Amino acid sequence: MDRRFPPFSPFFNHGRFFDDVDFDRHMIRPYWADQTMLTGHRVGDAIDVVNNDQEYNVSVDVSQFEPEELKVNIVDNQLIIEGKHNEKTDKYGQVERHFVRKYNLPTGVRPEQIKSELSNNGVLTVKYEKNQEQQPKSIPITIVPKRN
């Protein structure tokens, strides 16, 4: 995924129906064999930490870790984003990376409406809106994954 024309469905001119439709887990494939490179090409990992009276948005570059290798937990009033991947063999050699992050949390932040999104280039953004609207009510619905 995100490597050529036949990935990245439905933008797939070689049939458009069933040939090369797959999940986005193959985003790191171009970087799997690429070693002399940076954190998926951005400056730093945590792009910004916005903490004001109207929003709370934090953007993290996670292009070097697959979404399966990325997990977020909250331990003792700290926003912890930790991503560990096994040793990966490339055209150059073998590399294992591991990062642990912790972030303080402002008072009055409700975690029941915090939404986190991953962009195509490999940036995970955690967005929160301050205490002006919304209620802790949440009604989820079934979402069918896009296999092929």
Residues 9, 11: Cα–Cα separation, whole Å: 5
By CB under 8 A, name the one of 2, 6, 12, 22 that touches a copy of itself.
22
Tokens read off for 109: 């932040």
Q: Nearest approach, Cβ of 15 to a copy of itself (angstroms)?
A: 15
Residue 142 touching a copy of itself (CB under 8 A): yes
Q: How far is the CB of 71 from a copy of itself (least distance, A)?
A: 7
The whole-angstrom separation of Cα 40 and Cα 62 is 8
The amino acid at 111: P
Residue that is written with structure tokens 């090409």 in the block? 41
List binders of a copy of itself among 32-51 (CB under 8 A).
34-49
Residue with tokens 């932040």: 109
Asked whether position 53 contacts a copy of itself by CB under 8 A, the answer is yes
What span, in angstroms and rounded, lies between the C-alpha atoms of 19 and 5? 12
Please state the closest distance from residue 63 (CB atom) to a copy of itself, in A. 9
- Amino acid, single-letter form, for residue 32: W
Give the angle subtended at the CA of 130 by the CAs of 80 and 48, to the nearest 5°: 50
CB-based contacts of 142-145 (< 8 A; 24+ apart in sequence): 145/23
Instruction: Provide, rounded to whole angstroms, the least separation between the CB of residue 47 and a copy of itself.
Output: 7
User: What mask, x for binding a copy of itself by CB under 8 A, covers residues 111 to 140?
Assistant: xxxxxxxx-x---x-x-----xxxxxxxxx
- Binding residue for a copy of itself, selected from 6, 12, 24, 30, defined by CB under 8 A: 24
Min dist CB 65 to a copy of itself, Å, is: 10
Q: Does residue 13 touch a copy of itself according to CB under 8 A?
A: no
